[PDB]
Design an enzyme around this catalytic site. Sequence first.
Site, PDB file in Angstrom:
ATOM      1  CD  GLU A 164      -3.132   1.058   2.132  1.00  0.00           C
ATOM      2  OE1 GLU A 164      -3.549   2.139   2.641  1.00  0.00           O
ATOM      3  OE2 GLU A 164      -3.592  -0.082   2.422  1.00  0.00           O
TER       4      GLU A 164
ATOM      5  CG  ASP B  77      -1.028   7.322  -1.751  1.00  0.00           C
ATOM      6  OD1 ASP B  77      -1.276   6.859  -2.878  1.00  0.00           O
ATOM      7  OD2 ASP B  77      -1.848   8.012  -1.128  1.00  0.00           O
TER       8      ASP B  77
ATOM      9  CG  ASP C  26      -2.737   7.925   3.074  1.00  0.00           C
ATOM     10  OD1 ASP C  26      -3.258   9.060   3.088  1.00  0.00           O
ATOM     11  OD2 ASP C  26      -3.359   6.865   3.247  1.00  0.00           O
TER      12      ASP C  26
END
Lengths: 661, 660, 661
Positions: free
Chosen positions: B353, B386, B389
């Site tokens: 992520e 990202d 984030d």
Amino acid sequence: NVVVSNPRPIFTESRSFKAVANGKIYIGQIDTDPVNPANQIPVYIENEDGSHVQITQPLIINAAGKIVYNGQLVKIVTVQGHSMAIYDANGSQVDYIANVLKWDPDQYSIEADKKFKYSVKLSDYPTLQDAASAAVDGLLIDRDYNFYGGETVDFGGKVLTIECKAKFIGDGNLIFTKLGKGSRIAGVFMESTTTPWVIKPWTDDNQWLTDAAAVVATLKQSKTDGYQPTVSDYVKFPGIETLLPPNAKGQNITSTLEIRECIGVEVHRASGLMAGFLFRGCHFCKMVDANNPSGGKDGIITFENLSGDWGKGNYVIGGRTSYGSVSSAQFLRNNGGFERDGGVIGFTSYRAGESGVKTWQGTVGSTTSRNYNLQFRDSVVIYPVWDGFDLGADTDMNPELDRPGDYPITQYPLHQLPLNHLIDNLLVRGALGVGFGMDGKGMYVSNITVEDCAGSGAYLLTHESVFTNIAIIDTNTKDFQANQIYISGACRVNGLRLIGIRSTDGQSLTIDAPNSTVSGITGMVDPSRINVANLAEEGLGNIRANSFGYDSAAIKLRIHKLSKTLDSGALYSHINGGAGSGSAYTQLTAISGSTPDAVSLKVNHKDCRGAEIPFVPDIASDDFIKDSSCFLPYWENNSTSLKALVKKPNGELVRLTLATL
Amino acid sequence: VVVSNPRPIFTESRSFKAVANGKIYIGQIDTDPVNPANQIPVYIENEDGSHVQITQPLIINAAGKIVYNGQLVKIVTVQGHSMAIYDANGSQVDYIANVLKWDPDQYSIEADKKFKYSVKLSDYPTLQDAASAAVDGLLIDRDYNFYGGETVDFGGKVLTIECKAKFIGDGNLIFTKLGKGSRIAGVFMESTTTPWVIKPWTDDNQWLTDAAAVVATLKQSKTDGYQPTVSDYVKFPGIETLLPPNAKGQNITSTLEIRECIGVEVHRASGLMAGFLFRGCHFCKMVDANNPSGGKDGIITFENLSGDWGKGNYVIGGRTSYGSVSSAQFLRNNGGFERDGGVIGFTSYRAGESGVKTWQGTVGSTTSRNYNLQFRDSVVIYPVWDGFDLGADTDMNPELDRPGDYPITQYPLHQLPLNHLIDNLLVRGALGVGFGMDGKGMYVSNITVEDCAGSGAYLLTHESVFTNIAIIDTNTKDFQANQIYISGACRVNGLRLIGIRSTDGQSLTIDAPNSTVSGITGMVDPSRINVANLAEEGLGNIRANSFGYDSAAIKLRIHKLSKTLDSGALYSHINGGAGSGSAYTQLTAISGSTPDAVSLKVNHKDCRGAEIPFVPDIASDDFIKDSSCFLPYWENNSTSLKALVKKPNGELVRLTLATL
Amino acid sequence: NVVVSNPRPIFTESRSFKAVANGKIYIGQIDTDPVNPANQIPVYIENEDGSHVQITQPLIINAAGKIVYNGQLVKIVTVQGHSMAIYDANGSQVDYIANVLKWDPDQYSIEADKKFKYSVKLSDYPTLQDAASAAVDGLLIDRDYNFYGGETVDFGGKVLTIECKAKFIGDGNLIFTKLGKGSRIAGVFMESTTTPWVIKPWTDDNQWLTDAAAVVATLKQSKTDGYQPTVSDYVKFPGIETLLPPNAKGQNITSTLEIRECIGVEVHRASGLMAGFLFRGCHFCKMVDANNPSGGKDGIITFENLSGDWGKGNYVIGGRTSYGSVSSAQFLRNNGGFERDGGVIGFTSYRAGESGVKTWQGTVGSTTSRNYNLQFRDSVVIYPVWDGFDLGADTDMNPELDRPGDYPITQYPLHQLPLNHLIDNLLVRGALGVGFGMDGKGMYVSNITVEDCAGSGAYLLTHESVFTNIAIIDTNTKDFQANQIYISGACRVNGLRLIGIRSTDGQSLTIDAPNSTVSGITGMVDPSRINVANLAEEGLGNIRANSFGYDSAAIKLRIHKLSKTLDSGALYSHINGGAGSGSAYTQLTAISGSTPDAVSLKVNHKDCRGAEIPFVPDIASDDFIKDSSCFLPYWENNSTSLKALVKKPNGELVRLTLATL
Ligand SMILES: [Ca+2]
């Protein structure tokens, strides 16, 4: 499990089975004949209660083969290992043992001494000195220890690894001396005995208080979340001296670990409450990864070398601190040399009662407190009551007329010392005083960001110095009578970001740098609030001016000698009609009578595709025309005619008729 | 060992004789053991080590040796004792108040004082057994297979746990009740299971975006990829249906869980399919992570959904690699005004992520959000989503309240006073968004995002300030996205745009419709800038240096008129060639949507004169703008120039200006 | 203290009070019958000198109950664990002990072995290998150890924590092998035995010396404050090769810790004098927080992986070094992978005899020495004799025509390898050679600051690369025939600060980047000293030019192909009258006959409110007029008339009369 046994020894003969009745025992130095007095050692009866009585030799063996003193059965002991000789009543030798220790040799102790790590622990000793004297390699602090101010520990030149798992508690200094090079102290936690009165001059919304009575109303007795007032607070908060109760003034609570006159000692992961760390006359020492000690009255981390050689090799590396009445990290009389061997790298300071990082200025005692050749890099100071970084060496107000122990004023004037610090990549936010202050001549400073400060962003008493990539973003937010950045001397600034989101309408100048030459300002700065000696973009490429949310785009000129508030000329492009018209007009303007854009030439106004040309509104004087081979149109009202003042190619003037009815 | 005779003999004290038929009484130290109330238990110890308790007194035979039922015996006691010996006539032969005071082994006393205490796992069957025995050090010197949820109670002790072997298992190994100041060094977590992982990048390190291509990378490994998550179903549209059931819903992580502790640091951690969870902790740090390879869960998590808000929790230094979700993440932490927490000096590689994540929204029925943390001096490379984030609100449903946090009526969506200290961050290779955040009143500085397949920055910020931002060659996949987006009314001071990749295949470079910007540098296509206001208010004297073939240009563009066409210009153009000593200056304006349609020139062809454009037909009254000006115009049927004159008094007259 | 006892054993009978006169004792394995020779174990007479003589059983008991051998009393010794059987003269068993140890058992060793930390220390062993072999967990270096060059220690694959509190002393390499993964070595201090001749090419005011004779003049015998000359000095100080005496040439003094073919080893807080650290054939090794070792002949920190697999996971993290004859930190044949797993982060180098951080170039031995995918971040290099950072991979001078072990020249041209390093946040000051050097294709470089360097700021043999936020501030201060920054290939520069406070009048070009596209130059650059392929500011907003210190403001244009030294046109605003007149005139100019501003149109000169229009000073040629629907005024001297060359709306030319008497 204890085996039942018969501890009391009996002494029997060597050639027949008999007691050595009425015999004698002599006890002495190993591998000697203990019958001779010179070889004898003290022997003691040991009593049940553990008391001892020294007796004379020989030891007497009774008829049963047991040792007796005046006929009573006794237990004899000696301080060290020994030889033993046993004689019968005729004086013939029954036995001789050169060294009794060699008969029951504990082989495990030899093995254990070799295979285990050596460490002593404070729980086993009445005093810290006792533990220190016993230590060989490790020293564990495993009980909370009440020290007294000035308590001094001599570590005997030993290279010790001191592991702290409990606190040192007391008001004043715990003084460590004579640690060998390479010694380390990890996890130390200093805590004052006293809970002092502290002020907290910020609100629950983290706004700074500036009113003396408001600050006094915050008084509370705490070891943290505030600081003990000092005399600098009397200046910071006018009127507070009178308003503070006596018990909140002149306090002096700090629990300080003092490393005295050591080389090569590091303190790692230090913490505490009302805590201080002082390296006095040390070299090649480091404060590493400070674990947010909450400060007391004195500096949180201090390298002070006012006596002996200049400090060198002294660093704050990593970590962070909070609170304290004065500066978080400070230096006196340190010189890193050409090698820049010392300073502050990777450090964070929060809410210093004075400044986050300080190099002292002026005379302290009989000598210089100044510092040279130090690094200040990769560090952050947030919410200092005074300054983020205070890197000056000469006194601002009430300066001395001299520098004992340093360069004379006749060699280097005030604020022009060749300090030579390596200064790079620093961030300051929330300073009430000055975000970034310094002085000196010939300084190179880069990558400094100062933002969201109630006080001024920067105050630079520097000369022949260079500043590269400086950002001063929303400073002087309280609109004190101050600049956001001030530079006194003749300096160069290459890249300067000014203005975040706060208006400067309630302030004076944004930059006042009257002797400085500047390039690369960015931001929504009010150009009337710029003062520099020279400002230029010498090396731009082809340019485009892009205008958003206006009916025009502008490239303007402002001559600050003429006016700081009014543009003196401009090139505009202005929309004809509205959005999507495919048409605009270009306009070249000049100021007259302090009215910007009073006189202008236009190209394509109302999409007419022609040039609109201003003319002199009455008869033109000879001196109105500047150059040869030019003409200047002018109005003759009484004949409704345009005329032309012509300066011919040869430089002579002639007046012609240009347009008529 | 000296060959000796261990069996005791008891002889009399007045003459050399055995204590024949003598009696021995054994009791409490410093008492009279003849008194049964002072006596302690005495046992025969058999050669096989079994014991049988017998009555006192002990009996001495003719040889002076202890006997029971006519047999020589060895007698033992549990404690130190007094001993009294009496002869066959009840005379006292001896009395020893304390047999241990006769020549105690003084070595254990000195040894206990001089040696460092440490227990080691090789000496115990379970980790709890070792933790219970520990005093100071605990060495992990053998691999240890734990079960999920296995919980160790450290008794509040301040322990230094040195790991030189592996904790092996699927699930969480849970450490509890460590004292403040405890440290855990070198821990290595390794899963039992080898999961199925995807590797959505090529051997030339280009990201894959096609679901079928990503499915084709499936392999069973504990590293060099990650276990597919629910987010992959969005990241690679259609992959959910193409993945085999065994590659979906996997949950392999070997997690060291520090639960509800204060002042614990984990140093130099590593592993394979490894995670590190600080649950309900304060003043804990993950320091110098030694590149653990991640599993299904976050690699480093400070989660404080229960209890007080997290504080004093940091990732300091180190790096991580892989993992299905974010490398470093925070839920419900508040560093306070002191900014006591966050991520400093950290590197994340290939987070499934994001590299650094502050959670948004409600989780576990309360707020997962975070305030007043530091994000500094850190690098995130090749995240699937990202780099950073740092948002707090979910970008949807602005009506929804914030249980456990500020009410939505006090601070609207994306306008929380997050107050993070954000500075000196680098991101490269992000497939999602390099740098993302929200919040009101934020200050952000010294951010560099470069060479990203996905967008550079996505900023849902309001009344915030961005200083010295560089967004260099992002959106390199040419997604329908900006390189940097800013929703709210912000200020940007210093924005570098465009590296070496062309934006010809893209939409807007910067879309910041409410923002006021200054100091854009780079070869931006001006049509691809959208801002509220752009200005350079504080430039000095200017020079435009052209390295072009024959001209230099200062252009003007009014974006309200046209985003793609310059509306006017100031040009300098060479007369002749290099070294001619001559150029002409030209002032132009757009007409009929044709840039430079109308112009005035000075020195065209080195003529030393001004060429003036005139209206090509009769000028209407309203063509002239200002008083005391004239506007030349053409009258074709007289082959003459006229002048529309606005006199000094504002009135209009028409004159003849030039004729045959 | 020690209790008086009778250690010599006596053996008495079990059923009557008598010695076991002329008895026999057998000694064997525990819980066995030692009368059986198969169960017997060695027994020894222990002489007074501590020496042992093995004897055969049984042991003999005399009439006193004491053990004898040929009629002399003897001390018999054997292993702790044994059985014992005693027989009388008649061969009747007197006693049997299954296991003598079980009588008075030492419980302590069992407890001690479990509760104490294992560490061995060098003071207990003659050689380092002895200590290493004995080690289990900890190893303490508590005495100085004199090693010989090539001395090799095998650590048995054990995961050891080696704590150094003394020195390794020797010329040459101390080689550590077979350390287990996770091993750590802290506080190591290497020191040479030799004090070599060193040169010190800088003065007491920290100016670099460049003259060979001046540098030879600095020769001294020391372990620090200089370096041993090498063949690169022959090039750096031309002529020095012939001027050095033989004793100062070819020296090879370094005291080097060599970690050989290990995985996962960290050296922390290392230091030394004439010291080097070599990781040869290692992976996942780190040199952490180097404590300012002072270097010798070889690199101070080297990851060399010329054999076996490409190096990976190898870092310098934190710390600093000083001096050395060559580079401070260097890499050969390392590849960090896409993961960028290796490099230099947080490091400081001072006075490298070559470069601060070096990635090797070209062929070494028979293979590539080059490096890929490494980080170079958050680091500082000050006063290198050659380069701050040397991140090139291909040889500059007399390059190889091939790359054995690496990409071929046919795939990637010289200086154009896809090196792919992650380069950010670097600072260089005081470089004598080049502050920041690299080659490679496809590189991204950001936030590099180079300042105050005697040599060039940057030498970039890069192509298709991108440079963001670069600052090159007062470099080439010695005014070598060089640029301040040179870039060979087709690159992009976005943000480039040039010029601190030093004049460039004594220099050639400031930036020579002939194939590069550049934007965002700031600083007081001489525009004639810029050479790029394309310079542009495409994205500026509305602009204001602010002029300080002058009676005018200027927006100038320069077409470098026309002239690099003369502006080609300008837009000026000039004061009319005095300051505060509220009047100025705007002027638009063009160069003619190589005279800047030769021809101009003015607006509001002398506050006249009109436009002064230049006319052609003689009859205009047809080709002078450019565009349709325009006129060009010109002078007809004979008639004292202004005429207009008119290009009509239909493009046709006519000549009209514009103004006359
Ligand atoms: Ca006329």
